[model samples]
Target: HMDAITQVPVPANEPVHDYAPKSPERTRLRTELASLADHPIDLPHVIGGRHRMGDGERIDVVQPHRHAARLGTLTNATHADAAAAVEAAMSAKSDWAALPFDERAAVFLRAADLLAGPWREKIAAATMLGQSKSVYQAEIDAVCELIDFWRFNVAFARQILEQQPISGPGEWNRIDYRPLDGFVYAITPFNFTSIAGNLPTAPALMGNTVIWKPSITQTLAAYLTMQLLEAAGLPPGVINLVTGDGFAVSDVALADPRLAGIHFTGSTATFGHLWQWVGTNIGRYHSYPRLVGETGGKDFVVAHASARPDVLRTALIRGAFDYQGQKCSAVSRAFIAHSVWQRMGDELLAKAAELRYGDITDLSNYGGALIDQRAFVKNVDAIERAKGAAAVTVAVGGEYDDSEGYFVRPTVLLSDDPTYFGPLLSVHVYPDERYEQILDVIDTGSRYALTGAVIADDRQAVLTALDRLRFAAGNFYVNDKPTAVVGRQPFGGARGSDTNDKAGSPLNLLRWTSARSIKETFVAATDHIYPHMAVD
Candidate 1:
């Protein structure tokens, strides 16, 4: 028998654990990493609660920091496999959707508890090995952030369900929050393990089944997350996992008349392609497809002349290079006043030069290799292009070596051209007199309006930025880095960045549901009878 519904406790963000030297969590993580290295597990797609081996191509999942070492093999999905996944989702949609909301929520809540307890180090280790994240990075992304996504999403979904329409006396009005008519296609990126989990499960928690296609580079951790969900009693076919290039899956899912929505976090080009295809086949679908995506960003930072040198230096170091500057919100450009640059430029260069990059297993290292060879090649081309340009200068760290891994030095570029938005932090020095004009350039410089910040000691300059750059960024900051927390800051952007749906908030969850209004009258009357009919 089901228990009576009570208000679930409001969830809070999980605290990030610092896996310092000799700590228990650190020791456990190291042990798990060692075990994973010794015993590399084979990964397969989970469809309809069964492990299905792909009959097509086989792809090796390798560690980014040590490309020679294979973590596992992912059997690439073919057209048949993609169709099977969609069919599986369709088969289970009714029963999954028919389940009580609290029961559906309980499954994810159990998953969160399991992740926070016994399974924490295991997933963290998998993320570190598969994605080349450092111990601290793995802790934040795979552990703390993912747990927060699960727990907080439940609370957010509960709030969405409770939203009711207002009604006057002698009548009752309510809203029925129903899932979309069809399935959600979750296409996640390789950058964050937390995102890989959230993109699929967010829609699933809202009572929609899913076809989750994780990036080939992030398949190991993504697979582990699927296993964790299963252990928490998530039923078969609720979320079908398919691994590989996604070409076959995209074609099949996009053309299917049952395609309800897409949950995407990837490149702008890919998102656009999916959107275009959906539009092209708009009439084939049963309903208007919901497209929720968070795409690329050329995020930036602007510092006023009165900004503190230490704060500016820290922000540039952490915001631009943390996790190898792969975050969609990572600072790719900066506009600094000439005075502030003069005071902090040398120190910033020195600190950046001192940053260690290599295998994340070495805890002392600050960064690791790029996700794969493709990323390394793109960054290499970007660096070379900046070096060749006359208007740009490689201020420090233009060197790159891929002998051991795809390692690119944390390069900093200075550009006279306002439009040069490269992987490096492109700094354009401006005179204090033209501070307002510089702000204008920074605001309109890039197509992306993701996360950005202004570092300033002057209250007037800060207020000026608040007024002028209001729409420049959806996630704006003052004297802080742009990478946001889950509960504290809802992340998304406008214009080219995303739909501004704000993931990790009620706004994003609302997108996965359709509301039905119901009204009941206490006193029954002949509805056809009207005063005008009798009087006229």
Candidate 2:
């Protein structure tokens, strides 16, 4: 058993700056944004800690809020690129794993400091320009959450290592938390810059090497993350990043024997495909691939008759429309009692209609555009279909414009059926007497249990909703929005939403580790005879 070592101190969540007018942080951020927009760079694959352009078709990285403007360029990672990345990870496994746990922890701890320190605005600006986030959104996602993930994950990993079995007299018992036998493939999404960084590094922090493939839209920040880690003294080949669409990369990773696990954050369909493919090829791998995915969510909210009108108004406006409803935890659907709806429904719509969405660099807008044209088209189609449906009413804004940017107005749909992934808040009204019944309705109707909220002043109403929807959300809230924070709400989901391995906590770190129980006896027994035989 390894000797007892220094325990990591508890980490604090990085402070968020609002970037208000005339503020120093705001001034710095604006300067960085202008500098980034004026100068575009080439995003390349970083394998074995070396940068190289991909050997596949090229793609331009453009600002989603303004399609005419260019940010950078990235080439699609090919099968060759993926294979090489896998090789690099496998190649670095022994050295990285051999390094002490504290050494590995130090790397990420330093990374947290770097991110929270001098590199703050640069990364925030990159996320703002590339991912179309507001100043606050960029500060939280790209800077705060990501920094919290690194620092808190190290503390969590240390806790896992410290979990030892009780030792009897004349013997020693200990649990050795070791990394997976093979490399991990981390596939990340575009919605959150924090998630994109956390997916890959979570495994790596536990001594596993990683091959990270980020969403094509988020390569700017992902590449910057790689560079940031490199500056933090991470050794070569620990985390090898590939570029562009994941088809070719997945093809190679899915077929490789060295694929020990897959850490993913993306669509439910994609997670399903990866899971089934791994199942089909289960026999070929050296070990069972540990698949941990946080996928799609139709997250919702339910209100009771006794709910405070002001609280519901704020939760609905912020929860449903923030980041243009791109968050997996975004309130896409809501079930409200008729009494409460009548009290605040029109006002909610008016406030949502007034919420601003425009260019992120403007600093005054609440949010920016959808990630790209595909998202714009999907929202447009949903709005068009709702406008034509007899049972549905477009109670507020349904207008969309793509000429300047992929902009869609904050929309409210008063109907039963729901929409996914946009600034469209779908509502369903129920009689106030059936508050308990509506809980069952929302629980049964919810296809995903990622995140949900209940807004009410009645203590019993909150309790009933919580009990009924016990399995309804991985992260639940009371009288507040369903936004997740690192270290506080370890985010995951049940049912079809996720595998329920809570990220940024001890639970998710445990997934990456393979524990070995080591026992040593001081006194050796050479005789084979049993006590009963000797007595007889």
Candidate 3:
């Protein structure tokens, strides 16, 4: 726990500028063109200890909200490519797994230094265009927070792997953590360009190799990250990057007996298949693989009787609308205590109405478009359904149009009945001190258990809510939003949220390693006995 005390400095204010959707100096497409010219990204298979560009099949990665010209294209891998990558990783497992901890740690430290430079910019720009992130959002997603995470891991490796002794006057013992055998397969999402950095580095820092399949939309950023790793002097085959379809790649990785474990970040449905894959093939493997993931959540914040309406409004707005509500940890639900429900609801509504939704090209817009047209349509359909059912009452941003880009206004809704639950609303239930028991209400039938927060001014009320809400979340917060995750804290949830593997913490580094007990005699034994001889 002493390892959590290190102090690191990060910038408090992001660079800000006026809104401009089509400035000659700031068009999103122009940024991509310049990047392509400067960096010249190639979707390669880091297979058999080398980078290979294409094997005939190609996949196009286009922007979600921008025009076709702004989007980039790359090789879409087939089932064959996925199979090759797995075999290559399996083949290289021995040498990589055998490397010394110091050597691996050095490589990662160098990589962290490299990531803090221009590579960060490349990743930021790629995510901004491909995923329709604003300049500020892209900076957070790519340059700022992600690099901070890597820096944290680089420093953490030294503390995690160092061998320490457990000794006494007459007895001696020692313990050390080592790498889990075989490769760690990573399937990441598009929400954060930096997610790719954390996922692979966690395994690699422990001297384990990774087979990374980036979100198709994030190909350029993924490519840039691999470059940073290579520049850090990493040995070949230690961290492999492959670009391809989901089912084809997943099938090969999961079916192979050599895949030691999978670290995934995606939707709940895909994670389910991964869980099943482990179940079916576990009997054939030498060691059981670990399945660690962070999945979907209807994360919420509960306002207690004592909280100020103004403070509650600020936390809810930031949690719900930041990054267009795409974060896995985004707050989708809120429970206002009956005493202040009306007042808090009015404040939330007023704040939501002030949000600016426009093209990501505009720097001043608080919210941008969803990842693509499909997500845009889905968001619209959900809101429409909720409105039709009368369960949704929009206090702000009721009107929407589908003319140029996939954009949605910041919206807030209140249900007509406290008992009403709908898929469209992301599910918010009003709760009060008088509302029976919290545990009994949640335990009825809900399958989701990710993250939740409780806000109260009273110490006992806060403690009571925290204890009562233990089953509801993996991470608990008092008088704060549940969505924000710091690099040093253990982040992730229980039940379907994850395998309890907390990302961005010292514990995560240990997860990638296995402990081996080794003992040697410092002095010869005084007495021995054998079938034919005895010595004293």
Candidate 4:
């Protein structure tokens, strides 16, 4: 027992492997992709470290780019399954929380290494097949970012634990950064495989037990990630994997006394329901469950008069169309100066139309299909609405085909009227003079404050947008795209978007802990007396 602490290794700058022509990684990834697509496994729940079939409805996990291509089947977790998962989390809680922070962090530290090397391609393949991400997107999300999450989380947890209260003369003070009193319920989204791996483990790394319910579409990679953690020596019951739409899991977990926190990333409407349910049942729980969520975003890009045309074009294309715009930070709306739009609009539209989106296995394509039919329909509806509206124009890539898979071309709308999730970007061409008013329009228009970027050559315009629209976005960028790399970018939002507890930083890890201040004096006062009392 000593203050002589062992420092963990620094967070790795994870390599994003570009699967170029004849590269070994390319060959390995193609093989993994083929293997997963060929053989569909039973996606099961791992409760108490044992894999079991769900007792309820069964759903097929398929490749969104090739919907008929079955990847695996997952049974919706029943109330019984959810209850068991909660029990398993609780059963493991005492042991897991009692362990030293170093021992706990070592699991993720080892897992990051495991993922950075051997298991990388396999997970990336599952993400590509199941989540319909491009090779580069899959590589970025499933392997590189996930590796960063694990490694950085360990490093961040260390920093949290190192924070101690100052000691006075003849006394010592310390901060006991204990895990929350109850278990965490981690509901992850389908868009990012890295988030699925991250949500559960972030809390688990903080000595908290977790019940992880990942989106059914993302189950293949999520289950594999659980295996990865287990392979890294995570004990049974530390993180109980529950598969399904999260209906039953939410029903049970919300009703349970031990539901400590909800770590989530998904739709805004869904989070609102959870928020209300928790509020309504506030007094029923053992503790106030910390609800940390990254919900939907109506993220924007505002281009000023002095903005570079090529930079603005690339930002809109990459910011709006990457990952088929399934990402929360995807730019749904843009306010471009009329002069700049006139300069780059045609080229941007043409390039966006020319961008390839097809089956991800064919790596030549830029991206793949939407997550599923619902996403395709959502974008379709948004497009139809835009096309019908007098104020809008279906400028480029409005066509969609679900006959093969949920594929929507990289679309650009000439004017807004809304916010959408897919590779559909709506532009509001503003007068060059209204740059300042456009800033206010961007600020006042959306309830969301997730991510927004400004593209400009004028430093004055950039500084003005920065100051004026400070509250409009959480992750603001200057002359850059909205997509952020881990470690360097602490992700999350404010207002209605998220709790603003920046993930991948010390802030998010701190949410998982319940801090206790400890102070011990070398000598105690014999009497409760002051200098005045002594004088009396």
Better of 2 and 3 by TM-score: 2
Q: Give a tens-digit lDDT track for model 2, residues 1-536.
A: 46866878688888898787878888888788998899999999999988999779999999999989999999999999999999999999999999988889999999999998788898999999999999888898999999999998998888788788999999999888889999999999998999999999999999999999999889999999999999999999999999998999999999998899999888888988999999999999999999987877767788888888899889988888889989877888788889999999989988888888999998879999999989999999999998999878999999999998899999998996433589998899888898887887777876676788898999998898889888767768899987678877765575555464757678899999999999999997899877888754
TM-score versus the correct structure, for each prediction: 0.96, 0.97, 0.83, 0.96
Candidate 1: residue pairs that collide: none
User: What are the per-residue Cα lDDT tens digits for candidate 4 across 173-234?
Assistant: 99988889999999999989989989999999999999999999999999999999999999
> lDDT (0-100) at residue 113 of candidate 3?
55
**Overall lDDT per candidate, in order of appearance:** 0.86, 0.88, 0.67, 0.89
Model 4, which residues run further than 4 Å from truth?
1-3, 416-419, 496-498, 534-536
Count of backbone collisions in candidate 3? 3
Q: Candidate 1, residues 1-536: lDDT per residue as tens digits?
A: 66665676679878788988868988888888988877887789999988878897999998888898888998989899999999999899999999988889999899999999899999999998888888888888999899998999999888888788889988999899889999999999988899999998998888999999999989999999999999999999999999999999998999999999999988878988998999999999998999997876767788999888899999999888888888767888888889998999999888888888899888899978888888888888999998999999999897887778888888888888776222367788888788899778867764576777889989999999888888777777899777666888776575545465746788888899998899999986859777888954
Report the C-alpha displacement of residue 511, candidate 3, in angstroms. Answer: 2.5
Q: What is the lDDT of candidate 4?
A: 0.89
Question: Residue 52 in candidate 3 has what lDDT?
Answer: 79
Cα-based RMSD of candidate 1 = 1.8
For residue 75, what is the lDDT in candidate 4? 94
